[PDB]
Backbone:
């Protein structure tokens, strides 16, 4: 069978919709992981600071309290692995495969997070 | 609004690490359970899906929620049908579950992706199995066309066409779909509705229930005065199940912890049935329905009730501790993108065997040309007939050899 396919392809084609990363000037501060440029990252990429903390928690067994701009989280971890983590967050955690859009906002629809983009309107499932 | 239950069964099969469960979820609604005590037991996908069409053509009509406010229609949708999706993994090792699904299924869904090699063995094997177990309704689906250019997809399609020529199944629709976009599901629904003629089920032949997953549905820290029975999540092959039946579990469990295997089967009684959202009395076959039986929460755990069968008092499912398998060997080992010839069997070595619905490790006793005898460690049974697929140790993870038949 090779007749109802071209139309579908056409339809697919029709429905189709880095400088934004801030330079991080941070050296490997020991004992406790401290970040002062985290606020800027939160601002520019448009995301809540608590989400980043949650992500960090998910990644590694660290204990710390939230401080309002510069965070106090226990752990002697490297400046390049944090960078890698940030890169990962920028990539396969947020953004979209079909469109490379900037503005993504937080909405909750059952209990786990389902992030939405403001440029068009499409839902994606992120957990891993 | 009072909603009807499932009568027609739809199954989805493909290849490992491609994504099937996710696709199923996208098609349906709420997230599946499988893949400490709850949810996980054996790899399967279960969720409720709704067939409510709005006619006031093309492709777009269907939606996720019952309240429809997406394309441009204010009112309700007309009554068509309801479905509960059952998903089986497309692994060269996990085959018993697929086989089980096959007998049950009324509609089939096949998946091929454009990121690996073109000539495929596992898919072919699956097709052969389908052909064998009296099935004709097959639907071909395309997995991922997101980073692809323009011509590669076309080439792939051409290759597929070339491949499917000398086969039994011909009446097949080809739809290219996405899993994560949450669009292009209405078209699929439409296809499911239109192209397939709906078959009815008969309740005269002897009833069978195949439990793949075991559950304990309670709050973590349940009180003694209010205790619910152990729910057995099983797919029904044939025979309508109603409230008030004496159920038995077949294969038997190792209770002494010298080692004996000969013991009586375990009997249990139904408390309540869990289907769709609201509670129902009767259970229509074709789907994975939670049968709440009087079984302990301690008994249902992880690697003991994998593929244990359920039947009414005084029945015909056969108990096995030692299994008879008649194997047909292929020319060469298939699955690699290096190729090796199939060697003759060697005594006393651990290999994984798949019959009925069970996926468990076994030991080799005797060496022959066509037949084999194997000793089982964890509970296993054979239903009516069904095919066999063997998986052997070659390199780290288990690999396929071919197909087999059961004489008993």
Residues:
């Amino acid at each position: 069978v090779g007749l109802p396919y071209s139309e579908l392809l056409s339809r697919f084609f029709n429905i189709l919709r880095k400088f934004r990363i801030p330079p991080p000037v941070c050296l490997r501060d020991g004992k406790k992981t401290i970040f002062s440029n985290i606020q800027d990252i939160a601002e520019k990429l448009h995301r809540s600071p608590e989400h980043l903390i949650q992500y960090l928690f998910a990644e590694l067994g660290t204990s710390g309290s939230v401080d309002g701009k510069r965070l106090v989280i226990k752990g002697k971890f490297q400046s390049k692995q944090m960078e890698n983590v940030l890169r990962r967050y920028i990539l396969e955690y947020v953004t979209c495969k079909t469109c490379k859009s900037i503005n993504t906002e937080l909405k909750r629809e059952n209990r786990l997070f389902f992030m939405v983009c403001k440029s068009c309107g499409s839902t994606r499932s992120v957990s891993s | 609004i009072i909603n009807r239950q499932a009568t027609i069964n739809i199954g989805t099969i493909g290849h490992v690490a491609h994504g099937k469960s996710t696709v199923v979820r996208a098609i349906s609604g709420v997230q599946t359970v499988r893949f400490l005590e709850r949810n996980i037991t054996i790899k399967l996908g279960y969720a409720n899906a709704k067939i409510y069409k709005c006619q006031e053509s093309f492709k777009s009509d269907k939606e996720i929620s019952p309240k429809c406010q997406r394309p441009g229609c204010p009112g309700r949708y007309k009554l068509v049908r309801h479905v509960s999706f059952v998903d089986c993994p497309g692994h060269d090792i996990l085959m018993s579950t697929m086989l089980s699904g096959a007998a049950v299924m009324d509609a089939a869904l096949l998946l091929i992706a454009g990121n690996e090699s073109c000539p495929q063995p596992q898919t072919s094997e699956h097709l052969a199995a389908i052909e064998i177990m009296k099935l004709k309704h097959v639907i071909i689906l395309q997995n991922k066309v997101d980073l692809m250019r323009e011509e590669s997809a076309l080439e792939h399609q051409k290759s597929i066409l070339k491949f499917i020529r000398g086969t039994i199944a011909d009446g097949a629709p080809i739809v290219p779909i996405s899993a994560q976009l949450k669009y292009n599901i209405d078209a699929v629904n439409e296809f499911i509705v239109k192209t397939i003629p709906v078959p009815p089920r008969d309740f005269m032949i002897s009833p069978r229930l195949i439990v793949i997953r075991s559950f304990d549905v309670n709050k973590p820290g349940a009180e003694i005065e209010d205790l619910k029975g152990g729910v057995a999540g099983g797919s029904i092959l044939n025979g309508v199940f109603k409230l008030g039946d004496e159920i038995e579990i077949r294969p038997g469990i190792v209770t002494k912890d010298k080692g004996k295997i000969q013991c009586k089967p375990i009997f249990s009684n139904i408390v309540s049935l869990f289907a769709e959202q609201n509670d129902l009395k009767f259970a229509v076959p074709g789907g994975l329905i939670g049968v709440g039986t009087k079984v302990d929460p301690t008994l249902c755990r992880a690697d003991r009730l994998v593929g244990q069968v359920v039947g009414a008092k005084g029945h015909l499912p056969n108990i096995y501790t030692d299994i008879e398998i008649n194997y047909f060997l292929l020319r060469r080992l298939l699955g690699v993108k290096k190729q090796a010839k199939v060697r003759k069997l060697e005594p006393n070595e651990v290999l994984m065997v798949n019959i009925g619905s069970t996926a468990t490790g076994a030991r080799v006793v005797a060496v022959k040309a066509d037949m084999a005898r194997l000793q089982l460690t964890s509970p296993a049974c054979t239903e009516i007939n069904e095919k066999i697929a063997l998986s052997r140790r070659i390199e780290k993870h288990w690999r396929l050899i071919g197909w087999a038949t059961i004489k008993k």
Notes: Chain B has three domains: 5-201, 202-316, 317-408.
